[PDB]
């Protein structure tokens, strides 16, 4: 289940290992655009939240 564009859902991710490879290697993601970050570099970065 996914929420409507209004009253959209919001989930906070913190204190965990982010394996963006399993996210990029998904087939149905026909559109994948990142701003200020390159998908190939996600696995080497760390964020505050």
């Amino acid at each position: 289940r996914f929420a409507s564009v209004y009253a959209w859902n919001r989930k906070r991710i913190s204190n965990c290992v982010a394996d963006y490879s399993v996210l990029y290697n998904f087939a149905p993601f026909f559109a994948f655009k990142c701003y200020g970050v390159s998908p190939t570099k996600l696995n080497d970065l760390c964020f505050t939240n």
Binding site: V37, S38, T40
Partner: protein, 49 residues
């Protein structure tokens, strides 16, 4: 360099290079002006001596 990939980071690197080059050019221009001023002052001091 860490966040972006070379293709899209080239524009940002070029922007920063342009900014820093212009800053250094202005700095050296001011330095040349002050050097000419101090050269005139040194000529006056030598004449006075």
């Amino acid at each position: 360099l860490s966040r972006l990939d070379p293709p899209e980071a080239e524009v940002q690197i070029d922007r920063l290079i342009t900014g820093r080059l212009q800053s250094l050019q202005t700095y050296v221009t001011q330095q040349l002006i002050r050097a000419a001023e101090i050269r005139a002052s040194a000529n006056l001091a030598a004449t006075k001596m």
